[PDB]
Amino acid sequence: NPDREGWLLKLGGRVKTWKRRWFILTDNCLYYFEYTTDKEPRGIIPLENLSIREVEDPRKPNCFELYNPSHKGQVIKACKTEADGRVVEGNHVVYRISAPSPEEKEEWMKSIKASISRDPFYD
Ligand SMILES: O=P(O)(O)O[C@H]1[C@H](O)[C@@H](OP(=O)(O)O)[C@H](OP(=O)(O)O)[C@@H](OP(=O)(O)O)[C@H]1O
């Protein structure tokens, strides 16, 4: 079931704060928890119909983003839980994330392209 896991830094949506989060990529779904032993996902991002792209950030290096080619400037459909556990839809136009190192950043990038590609509903 698992495919790839490791820590990453992601920028919030409405509020632009980076949070260190544990990520798990599986079945073309990208999971992130606050801790590796967390029992439930803090957020879930369905990667279908999305694309990654290298970016340059003025605060964190080794970045890349997830955005929707088809609907530029439109909020990406995701599921997230608030601090208290309340379930809400995500509010990201793009998901910017900085890896700890280039090998990881690129390993994720490829690995995320691998899962999107291993999708029988690709266009
Ligand atoms: O705690 P503050 O400083 O308010 O910032 C939060 C965190 O960055 C959240 O990340 P995480 O959920 O990983 O803890 C993020 O939710 P997501 O990035 O998951 O959507 C929120 O986006 P908004 O709820 O859109 O503001 C953002 O407001």
UniProtKB/Swiss-Prot annotation:
Impact when changing K80A: Abolishes phosphatidylinositol 3,4,5-trisphosphate binding
Any single GO CC term annotated in Swiss-Prot or TrEMBL for this entry: plasma membrane
MF (Gene Ontology): guanyl-nucleotide exchange factor activity; phosphatidylinositol-3,4,5-trisphosphate binding
Swiss-Prot/TrEMBL GO biological process terms: establishment of epithelial cell polarity; Golgi vesicle transport; positive regulation of cell adhesion; regulation of ARF protein signal transduction
Mutagenesis or variant effect for Y32F: Reduces phosphatidylinositol 3,4,5-trisphosphate binding
Consequence the record notes for mutating K19A: Reduces phosphatidylinositol 3,4,5-trisphosphate binding
Cysteine pairs bridged by disulfides in the record: none
Occurrences of domain PH (ranges): 1-117
Cellular localization per UniProt: Cytoplasm, Cytosol; Cell membrane; Cell junction, Adherens junction; Cell junction, Tight junction
Result when mutating R14 to A/G: Reduces phosphatidylinositol 3,4,5-trisphosphate binding
Keywords: Cell junction, Cell membrane, Coiled coil, Cytoplasm, Guanine-nucleotide releasing factor, Lipid-binding, Membrane, Tight junction
Residues reported in the UniProt entry to bind a 1,2-diacyl-sn-glycero-3-phospho-(1D-myo-inositol-3,4,5-trisphosphate): K10, L11, G12, G13, R14, V15, K16, T17, R21, Y32, R42, N91
Subunit structure: Interacts with TAMALIN. Interacts with FRMD4A. Interacts with FRMD4B.
Entry domain remark: Binds via its PH domain to the inositol head group of phosphatidylinositol 3,4,5-trisphosphate. Autoinhibited by its C-terminal basic region.
Job of this protein: Promotes guanine-nucleotide exchange on ARF1. Promotes the activation of ARF factors through replacement of GDP with GTP. Plays a role in the epithelial polarization.
This protein's name: Cytohesin-3
Protein's organism: Mus musculus
Segment of the intact protein contained: 264 to 386 of 399
